[PDB]
Amino acid sequence: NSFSGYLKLTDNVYIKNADIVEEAKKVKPTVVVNAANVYLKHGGGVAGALNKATNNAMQVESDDYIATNGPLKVGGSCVLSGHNLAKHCLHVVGPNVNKGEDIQLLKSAYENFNQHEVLLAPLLSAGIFGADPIHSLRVCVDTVRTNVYLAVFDKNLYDKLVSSF
């Protein structure tokens, strides 16, 4: 967990303008967080970038998990292998606001972070799921008490997050 280049937002929340995949390769963290859907079908955001960097090992593992356990609940999580990127991957499902799911479930989603002392993580629901990224950062800051290192790839979004925080 050797995190460098992060801006301190609060006592336990840090942020960097970086690709979460490149951070995982540099830091080799204990836990990397995936912004997942309930079926762990890894799509066009963080999930697909993580999966591609595991040369699809993550998706094969995820498919087997889902065949046994069924879908996650919105706001829920599961711990699977981090493969070559981390010791563990915490797959967390934020609400899909674009499909009408309750934004209030973003609190429950971030509560999953508290089971791990330190995490490399993205802003949940703030991309393909359509939540306000500024709001997602606020919920993270208010909800997570363990040490979270947030990686935000889009510099325009990063600058707006830091400015309004």
Ligand SMILES: Nc1ncnc2c1ncn2[C@@H]1O[C@H](COP(=O)(O)OP(=O)(O)OC[C@H]2O[C@@H](O)[C@H](O)[C@@H]2O)[C@@H](O)[C@H]1O
């Ligand atoms: N490689 C990346 N590194 C860092 N941040 C990233 C990266 N790619 C996207 N982001 C940012 O991470 C945040 C989360 O975006 P998404 O990954 O799209 O996550 P979410 O909004 O929760 O959507 C989940 C959905 O997207 C699919 O990838 C996934 O399978 C699920 O269906 C957003 O702020 C987005 O700009």
